[PDB]
Amino acid sequence: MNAVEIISRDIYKAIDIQTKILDYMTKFFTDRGFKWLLPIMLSPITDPLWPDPAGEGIRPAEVDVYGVRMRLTHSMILHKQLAIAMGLEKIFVLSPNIRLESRRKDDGRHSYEFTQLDFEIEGAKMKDVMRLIEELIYGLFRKAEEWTGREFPRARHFKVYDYKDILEEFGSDEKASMEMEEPFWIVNIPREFYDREENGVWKNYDLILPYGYGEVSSGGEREWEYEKIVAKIRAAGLKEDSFRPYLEIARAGKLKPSAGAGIGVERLVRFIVGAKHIAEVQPFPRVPGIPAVI
Amino acid sequence: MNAVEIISRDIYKAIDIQTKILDYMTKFFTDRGFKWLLPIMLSPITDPLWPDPAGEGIRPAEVDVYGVRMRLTHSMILHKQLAIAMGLEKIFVLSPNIRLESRRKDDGRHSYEFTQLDFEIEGAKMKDVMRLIEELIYGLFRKAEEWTGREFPRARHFKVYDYKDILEEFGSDEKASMEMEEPFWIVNIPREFYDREENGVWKNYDLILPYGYGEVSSGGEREWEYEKIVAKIRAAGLKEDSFRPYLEIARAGKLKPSAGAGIGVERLVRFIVGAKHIAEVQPFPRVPGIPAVI
Numbered sequence: 001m002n003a004v005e006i007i008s009r010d011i012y013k014a015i016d017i018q019t020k021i022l023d024y025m026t027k028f029f030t031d032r033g034f035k036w037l038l039p040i041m042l043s044p045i046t047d048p049l050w051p052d053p054a055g056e057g058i059r060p061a062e063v064d065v066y067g068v069r070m071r072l073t074h075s076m077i078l079h080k081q082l083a084i085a086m087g088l089e090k091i092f093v094l095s096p097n098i099r100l101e102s103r104r105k106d107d108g109r110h111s112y113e114f115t116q117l118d119f120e121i122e123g124a125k126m127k128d129v130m131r132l133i134e135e136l137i138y139g140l141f142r143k144a145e146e147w148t149g150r151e152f153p154r155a156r157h158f159k160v161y162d163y164k165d166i167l168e169e170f171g172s173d174e175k176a177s178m179e180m181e182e183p184f185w186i187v188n189i190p191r192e193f194y195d196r197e198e199n200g201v202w203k204n205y206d207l208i209l210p211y212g213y214g215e216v217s218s219g220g221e222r223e224w225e226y227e228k229i230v231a232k233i234r235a236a237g238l239k240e241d242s243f244r245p246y247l248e249i250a251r252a253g254k255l256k257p258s259a260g261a262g263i264g265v266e267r268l269v270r271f272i273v274g275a276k277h278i279a280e281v282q283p284f285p286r287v288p289g290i291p292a293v294i
Numbered sequence: 295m296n297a298v299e300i301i302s303r304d305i306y307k308a309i310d311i312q313t314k315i316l317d318y319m320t321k322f323f324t325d326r327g328f329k330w331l332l333p334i335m336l337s338p339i340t341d342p343l344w345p346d347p348a349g350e351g352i353r354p355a356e357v358d359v360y361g362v363r364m365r366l367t368h369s370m371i372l373h374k375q376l377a378i379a380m381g382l383e384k385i386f387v388l389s390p391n392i393r394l395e396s397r398r399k400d401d402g403r404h405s406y407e408f409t410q411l412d413f414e415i416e417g418a419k420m421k422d423v424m425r426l427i428e429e430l431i432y433g434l435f436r437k438a439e440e441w442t443g444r445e446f447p448r449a450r451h452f453k454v455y456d457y458k459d460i461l462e463e464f465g466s467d468e469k470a471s472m473e474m475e476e477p478f479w480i481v482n483i484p485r486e487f488y489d490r491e492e493n494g495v496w497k498n499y500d501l502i503l504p505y506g507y508g509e510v511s512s513g514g515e516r517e518w519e520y521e522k523i524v525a526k527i528r529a530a531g532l533k534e535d536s537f538r539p540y541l542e543i544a545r546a547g548k549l550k551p552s553a554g555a556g557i558g559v560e561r562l563v564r565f566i567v568g569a570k571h572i573a574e575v576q577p578f579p580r581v582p583g584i585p586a587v588i
C-alpha cells in the first residue's frame with residue numbers, strides 16, 4: 001500500500017482494543033510486583049533466533065555506533081537474563097523487535113517490526129510461567145467479551161502437547177492451530193542456547209491460538225551455566241565471539257536460574273478484532289519481505 | 295566499565311521508581327481518552343532534528359531493509375502527525391529514540407538511546423498542551439513525595455520565558471536550569487519544519503527542570519499545509535526526497551492541525567531519584583560517544 005492508502009484505513013476499533021489490552025497487560029504485571037523496564041534497540045549482542053524450527057536463520061540488521069558494530073534487537077532475551085543478574089527479581093518490558101524475515105513467513109501473524117510484552121522471573125519453573133500466562137489470557141478474554149460483546153474461548157487452563165507429538169498428529173503447529181477451538185501449549189522444542197535443556201528434554205513452551213491464528217507467546221526456563229551454554233553455542237555452529245560480554249557474565253557465575261516468556265501484543269489485538277492479516281490492526285504495516293513506504 | 299561491572303551496579307530503587315512513574319504516566323493518558331500506540335524503529339522517513347538550537351546536525355543511522363534504505367527512529371514526530379491524519383484524535387506511545395550524538399553531548403542528561411512518552415492531540419493549541427503537561431508533572435511530583443518521603447517543586451504552573459529572553463539573561467538553557475528552583479517553560483524557538491510558525495512566532499515549548507537537571511519535555515503546534523511545509527524544508531537546505539511519503543500526504547491535504555510533546559522518561563527517573571548522571575538509572579547505559587559493551 002502507498003502512503004495515502006495506508007492513512008485512509010479505518011482502524012479506530014483495533015486501536016481502541018489495543019489500548020485496553022495494553023492497559024490490562026501492564027497492570028497485570030505491576031499488580032504482581034514486576035518491575036517495568038525500558039527497551040534497548042542496539043547492542044553488541046542479540047537473540048540468534050537459531051537453531052529454531054520456527055525460523056529460517058535470519059541475520060540481525062546491523063548499524064555502526066561510533067565505529068562499533070551494533071545489532072538491532074532480534075529479542076531482549078539475553079538482556080532479560082542480565083536484568084535478573086542485576087537482582088531485579090521480576091521484570092517486564094514492552095520490547096520492539098526487528099526481524100527481517102522473508103516473504104515465506106508472511107502468513108498473517110508475522111510482522112518485521114513488532115512489540116512483545118517480554119517478562120522474566122528469577123527462579124521460576126515452566127509450570128509457574130505457563131500458569132501465569134493462563135491467568136493473564138483467561139482474564140483478558142473475559143474483559144474482551146465486555147469490550148466487544150463477542151464470545152471468546154472460556155478455558156481457564158490449556159491442554160499441553162509435546163512438539164514431537166504435534167508433528168506426528170497434525171504435521172505442523174499451523175495445522176494444529178487450524179483444528180483447535182481453544183488455546184493450547186506446545187512444549188519441549190529443541191531450539192536456542194538460552195532455553196534450558198535437561199537430559200534431552202527442553203523446558204520451554206509456546207502458546208498457540210485456535211482457529212488458525214497461530215503462536216501468540218513463547219518462552220522457557222533458562223540455561224545459566226557457562227560450560228553448558230558455550231557447548232550449545234558451539235554445537236549449533238554459532239560463534240562465541242557473537243556473545244562475548246554475555247559469556248563474560250556467565251563465566252563469572254552471575255547468571256541465575258529463571259524462566260520467562262514474550263507475548264505478541266499485535267497478535268492478540270488481531271485475535272480479539274478477528275482480523276485476517278495482522279497488517280489490518282497496525283497503523284504502519286511492516287509486512288515480511290515488503291519494505292514499508294512509511 | 296566492562297560487562298560484569300555494569301551488571302554489578304545497584305539500580306533496584308531507581309527501577310522501582312521508574313515502574314511507579316510509568317504506571318502513573320500511562321494511566322494519565324489513558325484516563326483522558328488517549329489511544330496507546332506501539333513504536334516504529336525503521337522508516338523511510340524520520341525526524342531530521344535540524345535546524346535545532348539543541349542539535350548538532352547529526353544524520354540518521356541507516357540500515358538496508360529488503361533492498362531499501364531505512365532510517366532508525368530519531369523521533370516519531372512525523373508518524374504522530376500521520377496517526378492524527380488517520381483520525382485517531384489523541385495518541386501516545388512509549389517511543390525509543392536513537393540519536394548518535396558526540397561526546398560533547400555527554401552532560402549527564404543525554405543518552406544515545408532513550409524512551410520518550412510521545413503524544414499528539416488533533417486541534418490542540420500550545421496553551422492546551424502546556425497546561426496538560428503542568429497537570430501531569432504536578433500530580434507526579436505529589437506522588438513522588440509519597441514514594442520517596444522527600445520534597446519536590448510545588449508550583450501548579452510554571453514561569454514562561456521567551457527563547458531570546460533566556461539567551462539575554464542566562465546565555466543558554468543550561469545556565470537557566472542551574473539558577474531555577476522550579477520547572478519553567480522556554481517558548482518561541484526557531485527549529486524544525488514541523489513546528490508551527492506564524493508571523494515570525496514559533497508555537498512551541500520546552501519544559502526545563504530546576505537545579506541544572508535541564509530539559510525534560512519538548513513540543514509544539516504543527517504545520518499541516520503543504521506549501522508552508524515545503525518552503526521551510528527547502529529554506530533549511532533539507533532535501534524534499536527525504537520526506538517523500540509524508541509530503542504526499544501533505545499534498546493530498548490530509549494532515550490536520552495538532553499539537554503535542556514528548557516527555558523524557560529516563561530524565562524524570564533521574565530527577566526523582568536525584569542521580570547526577572542518567573546512566574545511574576539505566577540497566578544498560580548508552581553514553582554519548584561511548585559505544586555500549588552490552
Ligand SMILES: N[C@@H](CC(=O)O)C(=O)O
Nearest residue numbers: 075218219220260261262
Ligand atoms: N521472548 C521469548 C523469546 C522470543 O522472542 O521468541 C522468551 O522469553 O523466551
Ligand SMILES: N[C@@H](CC(=O)O)C(=O)O
Nearest residue numbers: 369512513514554555556
Ligand atoms: N516529541 C517532540 C520532538 C522531540 O523533542 O523529539 C515533539 O512533539 O515535537
